[PDB]
Amino acid sequence: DWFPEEPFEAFKEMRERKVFDVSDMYTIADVWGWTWEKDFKNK
Amino acid sequence: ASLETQPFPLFQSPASEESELESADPDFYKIGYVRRVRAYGVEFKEGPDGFGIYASKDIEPRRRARVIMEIPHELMITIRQKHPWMFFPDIVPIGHPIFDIINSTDPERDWDLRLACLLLFSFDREDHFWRLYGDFLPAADECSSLLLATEEDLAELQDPQLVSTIRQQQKRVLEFWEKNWHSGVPLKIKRLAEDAERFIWAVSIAQTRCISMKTRIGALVQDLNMMIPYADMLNHSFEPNCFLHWRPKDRILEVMSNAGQAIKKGEEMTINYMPGQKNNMLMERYGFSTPVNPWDAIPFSGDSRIHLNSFLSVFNIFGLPEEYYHDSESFVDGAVIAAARTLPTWSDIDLPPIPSAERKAVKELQDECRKMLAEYPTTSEQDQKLLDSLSEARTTFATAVKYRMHRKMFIGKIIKALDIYQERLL
């Protein structure tokens, strides 16, 4: 058994094996509601 | 003896018509003993009020609680209390129509219908222990649960709110049977309850025998509603000498005699089915009442009030309101504890009771109780007469009479309590 060499297929395996999924991809600006930080970081 | 069919409880004891605790048929214990049930120091006895557990030996007090019975999980029936339905004896095959029927129950309103479905299926599943045990369950004519009553009984119940709740229960059960035992169901469902009477019986048994506990099944801590074929023969008491307990390593339900309590040969081993429920709740679910019910209530509306603490001390009642108990230190019983929980009462940090105004309040509340008794067409002892002699032992009717009688007897004990309280306040 191996995860695919291609990163995108490896992400598809990450979903299918539920080792990592988008619901775990969260950070404070998305969690404590710091909606203002969008306006600061990228400028 | 791991076979045979049709063992039965000898009906010599339910022959009270002409006018008491013979041993249950030895096969009743044997079918358990062959299946790792153990009874320690107790005997099944068969009165006209059905089975009971009675101590067959004097049991000395012990430092920990002492085991009196062991029932193995394999003989039980279980439903999960919460929505994701699972069966831990797992009788029901995957994809059996029973799972579709049981899912069509309300998660919390219809747990009795679910248990009734399991009970019936366990009478259909050959060489399940309840295939043999079902003969010892009370038949539809001898079960006390008012789900088997009719208006002929509920007119004698004289408790319109409880009559309405019983009627709603019966309606719910019969509507469920009509919905889920229609002619389109498979034979392997239609044969479970080919008539309404079989289902209402099964529901009445499920209600009157449902224990519920938090348990551990291996790793899984979970809430179960369950039937235990020898702990359900314990009779109710609000002063129980035993309690149920769970061992998860070997999946045993123990029945444990209380720590530090001695018990006597012929003493009934009892448990506290549901702690803190009024007699009308015991009639609603289990189908019985008891006059010493220490949580019963009375619809007083008087501004007359009695000094609660003095009412306690005159009867040597002790503990907090959730805790009230009586000691050796003799008419004081659960009905007087109910009185202390129920009478219109006042309390103050240290202030003494007015010896006159408390007698005035006694007189006023006694005349209130007398008019409450006067709201019934008959006294208590007329129902005592209607129970010491009775036409046909119609179990639902006799249960309704026992209910009414208990309530009147109670209010009578209230009168006597206020009298003795005034006299003993000196």
């Binding site: 058994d1 995860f3 490896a10 990450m14 080792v19 991809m25 969260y26 | -």
Partner: protein, 147 residues
């Protein structure tokens, strides 16, 4: 490149570490199984959990929170990657057995294993606290074993 600095390190560690765990559990247990000396995977998986426990902070991960070359647990790296913007970067490392010991926080479990003088020298310069837990570091002190 594909997931950028906030997530590419974290999920790259995750994918590396899970792939490594699968590979080590296979390659190790395949020996025992092919030799017929059967063993339950739950015994191998504790060792493989230790081998894959850490990640290292790379040079581009230089921060006032973590210095480059520092070894931190995967949970620590994930949680700080979620929490902080302080240029966090790390890569998974397969810490061999003889390097999982000598990187086990109870310094007595390191010193009494190997490289004793080097362990003691570093830990004394670091003033390190062995908050006594685990067994090897407790039997030296003649304790009741925190187990």
């Amino acid at each position: 490149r594909i997931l950028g600095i906030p997530w590419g390190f974290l999920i790259g560690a995750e994918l590396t570490i899970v792939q490594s765990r699968i590979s080590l559990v296979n390659k190790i247990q395949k020996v025992y199984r092919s030799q017929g000396v059967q063993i339950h995977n739950r015994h191998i998986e504790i060792i493989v959990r230790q081998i894959t426990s850490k990640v290292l902070v790379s040079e581009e991960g230089m921060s006032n929170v973590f210095l480059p070359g520092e070894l931190i647990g995967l949970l620590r790296a994930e949680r700080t990657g979620r929490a902080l913007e302080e240029a966090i970067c790390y890569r998974a490392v397969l810490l061999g057995i003889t390097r999982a010991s000598l990187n086990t926080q109870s310094f007595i479990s390191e010193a009494s294993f190997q490289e004793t003088a080097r362990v003691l020298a570093k830990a004394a310069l670091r003033g390190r606290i062995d908050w006594l837990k685990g067994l090897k570091e407790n039997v030296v002190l003649g304790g009741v074993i925190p187990a």
